[PDB]
Design a protein around this nucleic acid. Structure first.
Ligand SMILES: O=C(c1ccc(-n2nnc3cccnc32)cc1)N(c1ncccc1Cl)[C@@H]1CCCNC1
Ligand SMILES: [Mg+2]
Ligand SMILES: [Mg+2]
Ligand SMILES: [Mg+2]
Ligand SMILES: [Mg+2]
Ligand SMILES: [Mg+2]
Lengths: 147, 157, 187, 103
RNA sequence: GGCGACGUCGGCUACCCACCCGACCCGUCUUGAAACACGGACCAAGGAGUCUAACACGUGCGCGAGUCGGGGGCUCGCACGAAAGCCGCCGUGGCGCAAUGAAGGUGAAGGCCGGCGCGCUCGCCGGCCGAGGUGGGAUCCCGAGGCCUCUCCAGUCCGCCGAGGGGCACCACCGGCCCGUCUCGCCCGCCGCGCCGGGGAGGUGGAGCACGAGCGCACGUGUUAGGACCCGAAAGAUGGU
RNA sequence: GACCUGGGUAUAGGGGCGAAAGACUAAUCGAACCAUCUAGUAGCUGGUUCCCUCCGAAGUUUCCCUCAGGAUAGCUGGCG
RNA sequence: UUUAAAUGGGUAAGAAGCCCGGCUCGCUGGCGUGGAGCCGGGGUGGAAUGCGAGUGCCUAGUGGGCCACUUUUGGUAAGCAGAACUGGCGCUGCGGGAUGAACCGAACGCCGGGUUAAGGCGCCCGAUGCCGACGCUCAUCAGACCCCAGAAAAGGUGUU
RNA sequence: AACGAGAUUCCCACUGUCCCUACCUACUAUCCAGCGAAACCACAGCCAAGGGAACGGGCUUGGCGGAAUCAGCGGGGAAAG
RNA sequence: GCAGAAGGGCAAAAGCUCGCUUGAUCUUGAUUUUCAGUACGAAUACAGACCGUGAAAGCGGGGCCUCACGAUCCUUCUGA
RNA sequence: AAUAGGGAACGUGAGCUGGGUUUAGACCGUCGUGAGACAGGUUAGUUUUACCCUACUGAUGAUGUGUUGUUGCCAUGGUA
């Protein structure tokens, strides 16, 4: 919309919104990130602290498939199955606990997050944290590991 | 231009005044500073170890922190267009108790108790303070004598 | 001449929404009738929240709503929120509370209506309680956005906590000088 | 050139890029050019199945994907050896063969 | 209440003329321009903040812990149709839902009750539950009392209500949890008893947690990269006459 | 006469040729002309197109091969 | 530099305040000490005047300044160079200063009536065309109104 | 020595270089018939003094101010390039 | 007199002489000064080790105080 | 008689002149490794336009007098 913008409203006025004195030219501070240590230094600290220097180890040819592990923590853990499972789990027959395997839901590690409910589970993950597996072993559940 | 040094314009104000040089009086150290004590800062010149700066000399703050030989004081500093709650560690020789609230602390003590004297006696004492009112229509007396006629003296060098 | 003031005489609030939603435009006509005529302060807050933006009407989940209605006293009231109702996956069972909102989401009004509660709009709110009697007008967490963790002093001032605008998180992205005392300094 | 709290950015436009520009204006025109290259390839052949031969069950590599099953390339002569069909007979039966595949 | 006919009545403009008063020529840089500063004889038409990418915030819309087909695919051969429509075992993927460390890696729930071990500065079993606490806090709830054509008896209502209560968002503060490091320390575990795993208590570093708010689209402002609002060098290079 | 000239011929651009003046090399020479790279760059000039309403500045701080310029704070407006 | 102003600078002028009761501490340590913290209870009218505040985001222009009181530095001085405080000009017309950036009044939507400020009132030129008051002054270079635009030491039996 | 369209000083002769200008001729200029540009140009075109970006044509207060022109002229327009 | 340029400070002393010593060590934060309220530098108050001195309270983590100094990248040594 | 002192954009270059300084050639001295430098000396070196407006100088003429001629008068300006 050329209609709705500042240049139709600013036509008739001499310096076109840029000033008689400063008189906007082309590149008065340099192009891009020029002078980032010299005359734009006060901009690069106070808004980008950390911008200059070596900080770690180089790793040539990383592959973003070796380090792939998604996480689900325990509040998002009962939504991996139906709600028809957990209502069927607790209605007083025996200690029949359902499976919840995060690997066919696309997760590899199970982290901790409070309020796992009172039912027992058997949870088949590739990895666990120790906060996660002791919430499971305190609701009467079990923690079975898969490769 | 102007040599931005610590202890710069204090040729006179970080000095002992006159004929009060020498070693310090010992009741300077036997003062009791608790949290929220209102203290004011007057840096001496004999103890070098904890004098604040030349910006707090003559100002007044409030104790938030107490340690073995010094006291943390939160003061306000006028920097250009805003004032800043600033907190400085100052040794105990450089401060004293501000008596600025001590004339308020009497008239909260003898004001609360005089409030409950009007509840047993039944009146409207009007315990709030007023400024100096315009003078009452009084009555002057020139008993015996008559007033003195004075006139401007001539000019002589 | 009268003074030397540097004018703030034009107050800068909203007297109408900037939306052209003709169904919100009739709620405004209903509630600014009820604002200037029923003599209540419930209907003035609800009238000025309908003028607000999409940011100033943040969503409200299902487990802030039932958490602020487990309180003493709230046992039979209605939760009015000017804004949308979502549902936590975190919550397991839902009580039979009575809600009243612009735009409940689809899974939220299925789990509310399974438990036996009732969903309301601002039309049948006025027919129920014109004064707003027995109402808990709840709000959403308006500084819950991703934008407010970028707001503050500056990311490179002392203690600051202010989350710089980096284009990608990682090592070699704004982590070297000003961020550790070895490489240069640390703020 | 920078300003208040913003992003430090690297637009890769420091090279003469207006000559090497690619606009997708022929892209509906090529979608109906390869439908007509599928339709006139379906009716040209036979009642033989469209979209070509039978592909094998194949599992993906690389930890991130090794829990899924993908359509592969051929049938890995050992599998043709057990099933009993010959390696040069098989690709006119409609069966894809990838001899470099290992079981 | 009164006055007036075929040339008079009212009217004003980009009409003209006169008078009295006021009034230096515009644009432009500049502390300062009528300037003895510069550009401008006149008229006509052309003529200068665009578009793409990225990001930021504001606002509008749809869905919402998810969102998004953009790339493909399907639908008689249809002008408009290079449109629109659909897919979902086409959601691969993108961003979000989790942070932290150089890395190996690790990875965010507490309080009470009842008891016990030297209830030993430490803790243990079981229940109840469940995002802690303080100070403010719109709204709402309760509310003695108060307000009506004759008096004692009863009803809805409404306005006034000191006080009291549960307290939204949000702010300040205190506590808690997760990761990196530090100090001080004792205990537990066994696909195997070790230059092994795990735990503790205090302090600090983090773009964290503390019942999710994001995504897609559109518009506006801003900044940048591109010829980049328009025009402008003295140059440099390659190939030729 | 180390003379004057015609035509033919040779030398070509960081090269030519010069009894030397940085002279001449097609009205161009202290590095030709032609086309392109190329809309080369400019912290420096000049220009920058309709109306009304409302608000309304600054020439100062700190840093910069900084001093005709920027980054930064202040002053401003708009949205809430 | 003993002494030491005027102007100035800070703080305080209540409920976040005051009092009482109890309990945690691994700090402190003759001590039911000291100090912090936590819980509970009791009493709100606490200088004058004026006023609605609090809060966040986004953000342009600017980064040559100039003048006048008063205060001051260099300089013989300067419509000179450089500071302090406040007001102005720049960004601002209008009335007066003949004239004018900055002086004196006063700040401005478009008009009608009234009144004024600074400044004036022979005639240009609106208003003394008042029977204005009291004196001083004669110049062969009279004098005549902030900034502001012309004069000193010295001298006169010129007049008062 | 000889030679310099080389630089300089004096002397003789010679002369309008001069004292000090005058007169004559040709060609123009001038006027007419035909034919006919360009530079430049905010608007324009009389002064004094004042103030002003300190050196005005315009502004302020004064002096004043009659059409239309011709031949010249080099004070000015801080004239043009 | 206090190393030195000045000013402030100092008397059983901060000076002068003597006796032991290495706190001129190890480590985390906070704060002040310059200030944008960033950094270096300098400084202050602590806290935790390990020490020195003194009969002890204490004092000491350089110089009585105000000055005496230096990023990223790279090099080098040290540490588990 | 006297050879007083000054101003008018240090009056006066579309009035002249071009000796001086003050482009390019060249010589010498000093300075510089050098290219070159020198209010150090010397020598050679293009001075454009008026036809516009006003000022001035002359030349007609214009207004008024009914027309036209003759003879005059003096306001004013200059002035030896
Ligand atoms: O002809 C000219 C001539 C004269 C003036 C101009 N000007 N001046 N300003 C001017 C503005 C616009 C146009 N021309 C302009 C041009 C050239 N000559 C000449 N004179 C002096 C110096 C140089 C030269 Cl070449 C010759 C040379 C030989 C002898 N005869 C004269
Ligand atoms: Mg600008
Ligand atoms: Mg102008
Ligand atoms: Mg080249
Ligand atoms: Mg702008
Ligand atoms: Mg005054």
């Amino acid at each position: 919309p050329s209609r709705l913008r500042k240049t139709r409203k600013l036509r008739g006025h001499v310096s076109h919104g840029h000033g008689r004195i400063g008189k906007h030219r082309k590149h008065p501070g340099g192009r891009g990130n020029a002078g980032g240590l010299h005359h734009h230094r006060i901009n690069f600290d106070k808004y980008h602290p950390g911008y200059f220097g070596k900080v770690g180890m180089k790793h040539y040819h990383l592959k973003r498939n070796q380090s792939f592990c998604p996480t689900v923590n325990l509040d998002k853990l009962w939504t991996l199955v139906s709600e028809q499972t957990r209502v069927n789990a607790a209605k007083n027959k025996t200690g029949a606990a359902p499976i919840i395997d995060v690997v066919r839901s696309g997760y590899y590690k199970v982290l901790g997050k409070g309020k796992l409910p009172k039912q027992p589970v058997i949870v088949k993950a590739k990895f666990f944290s120790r906060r996660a597996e002791e919430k499971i072993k305190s609701v009467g559940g079990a923690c079975v590991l898969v490769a | 231009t102007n040599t931005k040094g610590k202890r710069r314009g204090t040729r006179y104000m970080f000095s002992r005044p006159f004929r009060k040089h020498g070693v310090v009086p010992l009741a300077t150290y036997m003062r009791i500073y608790k949290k929220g004590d209102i203290v004011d800062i007057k840096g001496m010149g004999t103890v070098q170890k904890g004098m604040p700066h030349k910006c707090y000399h003559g100002k007044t703050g409030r104790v938030y922190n107490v340690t073995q030989h010094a006291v943390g004081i939160v003061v306000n500093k006028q920097v250009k267009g805003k004032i800043l709650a600033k907190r400085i560690n100052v040794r105990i020789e450089h401060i004293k108790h501000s008596k600025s609230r001590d004339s308020f602390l009497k008239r909260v003590k003898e004001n609360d108790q005089k409030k409950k004297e009007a509840k047993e006696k039944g009146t409207w004492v009007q315990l709030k303070r007023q400024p100096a009112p315009p003078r009452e229509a009084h009555f002057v007396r020139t008993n015996g004598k008559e007033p003195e006629l004075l006139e401007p003296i001539p000019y002589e060098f | 001449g009268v003074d030397i003031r540097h004018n703030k005489d034009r107050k800068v609030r909203r007297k109408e929404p900037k939306s052209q939603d003709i169904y919100l435009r009739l709620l405004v006509k209903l509630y600014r009738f009820l604002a200037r005529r029923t003599n209540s302060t419930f209907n003035q807050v609800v009238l000025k929240r309908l003028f607000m933006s999409r940011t100033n009407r943040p969503p409200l989940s299902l487990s802030r709503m039932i958490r602020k209605m487990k309180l003493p006293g709230r046992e039979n009231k209605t939760a009015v929120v000017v804004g949308t109702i979502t549902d936590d996956v975190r919550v397991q069972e839902v009580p039979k509370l009575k809600v009243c909102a612009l735009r409940v989401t689809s899974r939220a009004r299925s789990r509310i209506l399974r438990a036996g509660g009732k969903i309301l709009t601002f039309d049948q709110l006025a027919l129920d309680s014109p004064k707003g009697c027995g109402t808990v007008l709840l709000s959403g967490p308006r500084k819950g956005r991703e934008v407010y963790r970028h707001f503050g002093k500056a990311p490179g001032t002392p203690h600051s906590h202010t989350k710089p605008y980096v284009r990608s998180k990682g090592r070699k992205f704004e982590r070297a000088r000003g961020r550790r005392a070895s490489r240069g300094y640390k703020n | 050139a920078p300003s208040r709290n913003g992003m430090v950015l690297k637009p890769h436009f420091h090279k003469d890029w207006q000559r090497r520009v690619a606009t997708w204006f022929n892209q509906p025109a090529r979608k109906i050019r390869r439908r007509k290259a599928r339709q006139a390839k379906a009716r040209r052949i036979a009642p033989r199945p469209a979209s070509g031969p039978i592909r094998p069950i194949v599992r993906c590599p690389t930890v991130r994907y090794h829990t899924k099953v993908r359509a592969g390339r051929g049938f890995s002569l050992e599998e043709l050896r057990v099933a009993g069909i010959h390696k040069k007979v098989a690709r006119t039966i409609g069966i894809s063969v990838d001899p470099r595949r290992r079981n």
